[PDB]
Amino acid sequence: IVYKPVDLSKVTSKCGSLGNIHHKPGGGQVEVKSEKLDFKDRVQSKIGSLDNITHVPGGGNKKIETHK
Amino acid sequence: IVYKPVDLSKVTSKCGSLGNIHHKPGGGQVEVKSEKLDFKDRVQSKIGSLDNITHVPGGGNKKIETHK
Amino acid sequence: IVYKPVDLSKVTSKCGSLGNIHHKPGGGQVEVKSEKLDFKDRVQSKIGSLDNITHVPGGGNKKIETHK
């Protein structure tokens, strides 16, 4: 009996922002004015002219193999 | 009995924003005026002139290979 | 008995925004005026001129193989 399985296989994930070009991007003025506001539970707020956001919860790899 | 399976295969995920060109992208002025507002539960707010978001929960790979 | 299966397969996914050109995209002026609003439950709000958004929950790959 000769048992010589060969695995050269590639499992690859390229997830998120990759190889992009952003030439001279520009956010104009942002102006937020607030008066007599009332809040009675949690507040999350974000303010800003130019944003570039990447989230990657994904992109995981799994490779299960078995020989008998 | 001679057993010589060969795997050279590829499994590629390529997910999100890839290889894009943004050339002089311009966010205009953004102006937010808020007066006498009442909030009795949770607030999320985002304010901005130019925004670029990539979100990737996906793009995962699974390879399974069994030999008997 | 000789057993020599060869796998050269290329399982591939390309999901989201790929290889686009955005030449001088211009968001306009955005003006939001709010007065005397009541919110008895949760609020989510995005305000802005020029948003690029890519969301990819999908694009995953599964490969199963068995030899007997």
mmCIF file with all atom_site columns, N, CA and C in Angstrom, chain A residues 7 9-12 60-67, chain B residues 3 5 7 9-11 60-68, chain C residues 7 9 11 61-68:
data_model
loop_
_atom_site.group_PDB
_atom_site.id
_atom_site.type_symbol
_atom_site.label_atom_id
_atom_site.label_alt_id
_atom_site.label_comp_id
_atom_site.label_asym_id
_atom_site.label_entity_id
_atom_site.label_seq_id
_atom_site.pdbx_PDB_ins_code
_atom_site.Cartn_x
_atom_site.Cartn_y
_atom_site.Cartn_z
_atom_site.occupancy
_atom_site.B_iso_or_equiv
_atom_site.pdbx_formal_charge
_atom_site.auth_seq_id
_atom_site.auth_comp_id
_atom_site.auth_asym_id
_atom_site.auth_atom_id
_atom_site.pdbx_PDB_model_num
ATOM 1   N N  . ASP A 1 7  ? -1.354  17.945 -0.870 1.00 0.00 ? 7  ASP A N  1
ATOM 2   C CA . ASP A 1 7  ? -2.159  19.159 -0.823 1.00 0.00 ? 7  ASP A CA 1
ATOM 3   C C  . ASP A 1 7  ? -1.275  20.400 -0.958 1.00 0.00 ? 7  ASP A C  1
ATOM 4   N N  . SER A 1 9  ? -3.180  23.245 -2.015 1.00 0.00 ? 9  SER A N  1
ATOM 5   C CA . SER A 1 9  ? -4.311  24.159 -2.150 1.00 0.00 ? 9  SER A CA 1
ATOM 6   C C  . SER A 1 9  ? -4.190  25.420 -1.296 1.00 0.00 ? 9  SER A C  1
ATOM 7   N N  . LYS A 1 10 ? -4.722  26.540 -1.799 1.00 0.00 ? 10 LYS A N  1
ATOM 8   C CA . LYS A 1 10 ? -4.719  27.849 -1.136 1.00 0.00 ? 10 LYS A CA 1
ATOM 9   C C  . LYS A 1 10 ? -6.127  28.238 -0.705 1.00 0.00 ? 10 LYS A C  1
ATOM 10  N N  . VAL A 1 11 ? -6.328  28.521 0.573  1.00 0.00 ? 11 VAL A N  1
ATOM 11  C CA . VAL A 1 11 ? -7.547  29.153 1.090  1.00 0.00 ? 11 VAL A CA 1
ATOM 12  C C  . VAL A 1 11 ? -7.191  30.592 1.444  1.00 0.00 ? 11 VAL A C  1
ATOM 13  N N  . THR A 1 12 ? -7.880  31.564 0.851  1.00 0.00 ? 12 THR A N  1
ATOM 14  C CA . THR A 1 12 ? -7.530  32.991 0.942  1.00 0.00 ? 12 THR A CA 1
ATOM 15  C C  . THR A 1 12 ? -8.770  33.844 1.160  1.00 0.00 ? 12 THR A C  1
ATOM 16  N N  . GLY A 1 60 ? -12.937 35.158 8.043  1.00 0.00 ? 60 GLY A N  1
ATOM 17  C CA . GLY A 1 60 ? -12.324 33.982 8.663  1.00 0.00 ? 60 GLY A CA 1
ATOM 18  C C  . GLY A 1 60 ? -12.179 32.804 7.700  1.00 0.00 ? 60 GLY A C  1
ATOM 19  N N  . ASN A 1 61 ? -11.163 31.971 7.901  1.00 0.00 ? 61 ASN A N  1
ATOM 20  C CA . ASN A 1 61 ? -10.921 30.761 7.120  1.00 0.00 ? 61 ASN A CA 1
ATOM 21  C C  . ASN A 1 61 ? -10.933 29.530 8.026  1.00 0.00 ? 61 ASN A C  1
ATOM 22  N N  . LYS A 1 62 ? -11.483 28.421 7.537  1.00 0.00 ? 62 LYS A N  1
ATOM 23  C CA . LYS A 1 62 ? -11.475 27.119 8.207  1.00 0.00 ? 62 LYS A CA 1
ATOM 24  C C  . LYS A 1 62 ? -11.098 26.032 7.215  1.00 0.00 ? 62 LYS A C  1
ATOM 25  N N  . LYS A 1 63 ? -10.224 25.118 7.616  1.00 0.00 ? 63 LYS A N  1
ATOM 26  C CA . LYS A 1 63 ? -9.677  24.065 6.759  1.00 0.00 ? 63 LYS A CA 1
ATOM 27  C C  . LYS A 1 63 ? -9.558  22.785 7.576  1.00 0.00 ? 63 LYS A C  1
ATOM 28  N N  . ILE A 1 64 ? -10.548 21.911 7.458  1.00 0.00 ? 64 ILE A N  1
ATOM 29  C CA . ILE A 1 64 ? -10.619 20.644 8.189  1.00 0.00 ? 64 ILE A CA 1
ATOM 30  C C  . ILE A 1 64 ? -10.260 19.527 7.228  1.00 0.00 ? 64 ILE A C  1
ATOM 31  N N  . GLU A 1 65 ? -9.290  18.696 7.573  1.00 0.00 ? 65 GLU A N  1
ATOM 32  C CA . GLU A 1 65 ? -8.909  17.550 6.750  1.00 0.00 ? 65 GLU A CA 1
ATOM 33  C C  . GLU A 1 65 ? -8.703  16.305 7.601  1.00 0.00 ? 65 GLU A C  1
ATOM 34  N N  . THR A 1 66 ? -8.891  15.132 7.014  1.00 0.00 ? 66 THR A N  1
ATOM 35  C CA . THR A 1 66 ? -8.842  13.847 7.718  1.00 0.00 ? 66 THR A CA 1
ATOM 36  C C  . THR A 1 66 ? -8.326  12.770 6.784  1.00 0.00 ? 66 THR A C  1
ATOM 37  N N  . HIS A 1 67 ? -7.495  11.872 7.301  1.00 0.00 ? 67 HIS A N  1
ATOM 38  C CA . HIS A 1 67 ? -6.947  10.716 6.602  1.00 0.00 ? 67 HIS A CA 1
ATOM 39  C C  . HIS A 1 67 ? -7.104  9.469  7.485  1.00 0.00 ? 67 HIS A C  1
ATOM 40  N N  . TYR B 1 3  ? -2.152  5.341  -3.900 1.00 0.00 ? 3  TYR B N  1
ATOM 41  C CA . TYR B 1 3  ? -3.102  6.402  -3.583 1.00 0.00 ? 3  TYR B CA 1
ATOM 42  C C  . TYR B 1 3  ? -2.404  7.762  -3.551 1.00 0.00 ? 3  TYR B C  1
ATOM 43  N N  . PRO B 1 5  ? -3.870  11.266 -4.618 1.00 0.00 ? 5  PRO B N  1
ATOM 44  C CA . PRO B 1 5  ? -4.681  12.425 -4.967 1.00 0.00 ? 5  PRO B CA 1
ATOM 45  C C  . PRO B 1 5  ? -3.862  13.712 -4.813 1.00 0.00 ? 5  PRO B C  1
ATOM 46  N N  . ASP B 1 7  ? -4.252  17.904 -4.700 1.00 0.00 ? 7  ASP B N  1
ATOM 47  C CA . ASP B 1 7  ? -5.061  19.117 -4.662 1.00 0.00 ? 7  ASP B CA 1
ATOM 48  C C  . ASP B 1 7  ? -4.160  20.336 -4.851 1.00 0.00 ? 7  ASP B C  1
ATOM 49  N N  . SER B 1 9  ? -5.972  23.290 -5.794 1.00 0.00 ? 9  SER B N  1
ATOM 50  C CA . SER B 1 9  ? -7.075  24.222 -5.955 1.00 0.00 ? 9  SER B CA 1
ATOM 51  C C  . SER B 1 9  ? -6.953  25.490 -5.115 1.00 0.00 ? 9  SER B C  1
ATOM 52  N N  . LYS B 1 10 ? -7.716  26.515 -5.480 1.00 0.00 ? 10 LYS B N  1
ATOM 53  C CA . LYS B 1 10 ? -7.803  27.787 -4.761 1.00 0.00 ? 10 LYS B CA 1
ATOM 54  C C  . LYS B 1 10 ? -9.237  28.031 -4.301 1.00 0.00 ? 10 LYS B C  1
ATOM 55  N N  . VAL B 1 11 ? -9.398  28.630 -3.129 1.00 0.00 ? 11 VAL B N  1
ATOM 56  C CA . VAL B 1 11 ? -10.683 29.050 -2.557 1.00 0.00 ? 11 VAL B CA 1
ATOM 57  C C  . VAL B 1 11 ? -10.521 30.489 -2.083 1.00 0.00 ? 11 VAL B C  1
ATOM 58  N N  . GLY B 1 60 ? -16.003 34.820 4.366  1.00 0.00 ? 60 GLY B N  1
ATOM 59  C CA . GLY B 1 60 ? -15.339 33.682 5.000  1.00 0.00 ? 60 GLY B CA 1
ATOM 60  C C  . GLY B 1 60 ? -15.227 32.469 4.072  1.00 0.00 ? 60 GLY B C  1
ATOM 61  N N  . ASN B 1 61 ? -14.261 31.587 4.297  1.00 0.00 ? 61 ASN B N  1
ATOM 62  C CA . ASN B 1 61 ? -14.093 30.357 3.517  1.00 0.00 ? 61 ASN B CA 1
ATOM 63  C C  . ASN B 1 61 ? -14.049 29.115 4.409  1.00 0.00 ? 61 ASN B C  1
ATOM 64  N N  . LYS B 1 62 ? -14.671 28.021 3.975  1.00 0.00 ? 62 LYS B N  1
ATOM 65  C CA . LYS B 1 62 ? -14.511 26.695 4.579  1.00 0.00 ? 62 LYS B CA 1
ATOM 66  C C  . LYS B 1 62 ? -14.088 25.678 3.528  1.00 0.00 ? 62 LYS B C  1
ATOM 67  N N  . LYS B 1 63 ? -12.954 25.009 3.717  1.00 0.00 ? 63 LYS B N  1
ATOM 68  C CA . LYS B 1 63 ? -12.573 23.801 2.972  1.00 0.00 ? 63 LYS B CA 1
ATOM 69  C C  . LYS B 1 63 ? -12.665 22.600 3.911  1.00 0.00 ? 63 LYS B C  1
ATOM 70  N N  . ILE B 1 64 ? -13.374 21.557 3.519  1.00 0.00 ? 64 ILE B N  1
ATOM 71  C CA . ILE B 1 64 ? -13.354 20.248 4.176  1.00 0.00 ? 64 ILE B CA 1
ATOM 72  C C  . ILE B 1 64 ? -12.845 19.223 3.169  1.00 0.00 ? 64 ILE B C  1
ATOM 73  N N  . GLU B 1 65 ? -11.893 18.371 3.534  1.00 0.00 ? 65 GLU B N  1
ATOM 74  C CA . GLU B 1 65 ? -11.408 17.303 2.649  1.00 0.00 ? 65 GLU B CA 1
ATOM 75  C C  . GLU B 1 65 ? -11.113 16.009 3.425  1.00 0.00 ? 65 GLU B C  1
ATOM 76  N N  . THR B 1 66 ? -11.880 14.949 3.171  1.00 0.00 ? 66 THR B N  1
ATOM 77  C CA . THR B 1 66 ? -11.772 13.658 3.879  1.00 0.00 ? 66 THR B CA 1
ATOM 78  C C  . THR B 1 66 ? -11.239 12.556 2.965  1.00 0.00 ? 66 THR B C  1
ATOM 79  N N  . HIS B 1 67 ? -10.223 11.813 3.397  1.00 0.00 ? 67 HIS B N  1
ATOM 80  C CA . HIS B 1 67 ? -9.623  10.681 2.686  1.00 0.00 ? 67 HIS B CA 1
ATOM 81  C C  . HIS B 1 67 ? -9.751  9.369  3.476  1.00 0.00 ? 67 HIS B C  1
ATOM 82  N N  . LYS B 1 68 ? -10.339 8.317  2.893  1.00 0.00 ? 68 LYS B N  1
ATOM 83  C CA . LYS B 1 68 ? -10.467 6.986  3.520  1.00 0.00 ? 68 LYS B CA 1
ATOM 84  C C  . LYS B 1 68 ? -10.109 5.848  2.562  1.00 0.00 ? 68 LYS B C  1
ATOM 85  N N  . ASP C 1 7  ? -6.956  17.985 -8.658 1.00 0.00 ? 7  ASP C N  1
ATOM 86  C CA . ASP C 1 7  ? -7.841  19.139 -8.531 1.00 0.00 ? 7  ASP C CA 1
ATOM 87  C C  . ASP C 1 7  ? -7.083  20.449 -8.767 1.00 0.00 ? 7  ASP C C  1
ATOM 88  N N  . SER C 1 9  ? -9.140  23.363 -9.455 1.00 0.00 ? 9  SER C N  1
ATOM 89  C CA . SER C 1 9  ? -10.294 24.270 -9.388 1.00 0.00 ? 9  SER C CA 1
ATOM 90  C C  . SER C 1 9  ? -9.981  25.608 -8.709 1.00 0.00 ? 9  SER C C  1
ATOM 91  N N  . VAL C 1 11 ? -12.375 28.115 -6.975 1.00 0.00 ? 11 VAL C N  1
ATOM 92  C CA . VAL C 1 11 ? -13.589 28.646 -6.326 1.00 0.00 ? 11 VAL C CA 1
ATOM 93  C C  . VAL C 1 11 ? -13.339 30.084 -5.875 1.00 0.00 ? 11 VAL C C  1
ATOM 94  N N  . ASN C 1 61 ? -17.380 31.306 0.759  1.00 0.00 ? 61 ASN C N  1
ATOM 95  C CA . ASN C 1 61 ? -17.252 30.068 -0.020 1.00 0.00 ? 61 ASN C CA 1
ATOM 96  C C  . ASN C 1 61 ? -17.216 28.829 0.878  1.00 0.00 ? 61 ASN C C  1
ATOM 97  N N  . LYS C 1 62 ? -17.856 27.748 0.446  1.00 0.00 ? 62 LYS C N  1
ATOM 98  C CA . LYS C 1 62 ? -17.753 26.423 1.059  1.00 0.00 ? 62 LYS C CA 1
ATOM 99  C C  . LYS C 1 62 ? -17.360 25.413 -0.005 1.00 0.00 ? 62 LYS C C  1
ATOM 100 N N  . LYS C 1 63 ? -16.289 24.671 0.242  1.00 0.00 ? 63 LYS C N  1
ATOM 101 C CA . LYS C 1 63 ? -15.847 23.545 -0.575 1.00 0.00 ? 63 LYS C CA 1
ATOM 102 C C  . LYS C 1 63 ? -15.757 22.296 0.293  1.00 0.00 ? 63 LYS C C  1
ATOM 103 N N  . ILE C 1 64 ? -16.502 21.257 -0.045 1.00 0.00 ? 64 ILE C N  1
ATOM 104 C CA . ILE C 1 64 ? -16.443 19.947 0.608  1.00 0.00 ? 64 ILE C CA 1
ATOM 105 C C  . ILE C 1 64 ? -15.946 18.931 -0.412 1.00 0.00 ? 64 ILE C C  1
ATOM 106 N N  . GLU C 1 65 ? -14.986 18.095 -0.045 1.00 0.00 ? 65 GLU C N  1
ATOM 107 C CA . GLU C 1 65 ? -14.495 17.008 -0.888 1.00 0.00 ? 65 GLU C CA 1
ATOM 108 C C  . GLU C 1 65 ? -14.301 15.725 -0.079 1.00 0.00 ? 65 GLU C C  1
ATOM 109 N N  . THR C 1 66 ? -14.566 14.568 -0.671 1.00 0.00 ? 66 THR C N  1
ATOM 110 C CA . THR C 1 66 ? -14.429 13.261 -0.019 1.00 0.00 ? 66 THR C CA 1
ATOM 111 C C  . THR C 1 66 ? -13.870 12.247 -1.006 1.00 0.00 ? 66 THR C C  1
ATOM 112 N N  . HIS C 1 67 ? -12.945 11.415 -0.551 1.00 0.00 ? 67 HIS C N  1
ATOM 113 C CA . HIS C 1 67 ? -12.304 10.343 -1.304 1.00 0.00 ? 67 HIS C CA 1
ATOM 114 C C  . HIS C 1 67 ? -12.415 9.034  -0.520 1.00 0.00 ? 67 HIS C C  1
ATOM 115 N N  . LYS C 1 68 ? -12.799 7.943  -1.183 1.00 0.00 ? 68 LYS C N  1
ATOM 116 C CA . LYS C 1 68 ? -13.098 6.645  -0.563 1.00 0.00 ? 68 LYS C CA 1
ATOM 117 C C  . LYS C 1 68 ? -12.692 5.490  -1.481 1.00 0.00 ? 68 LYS C C  1
#
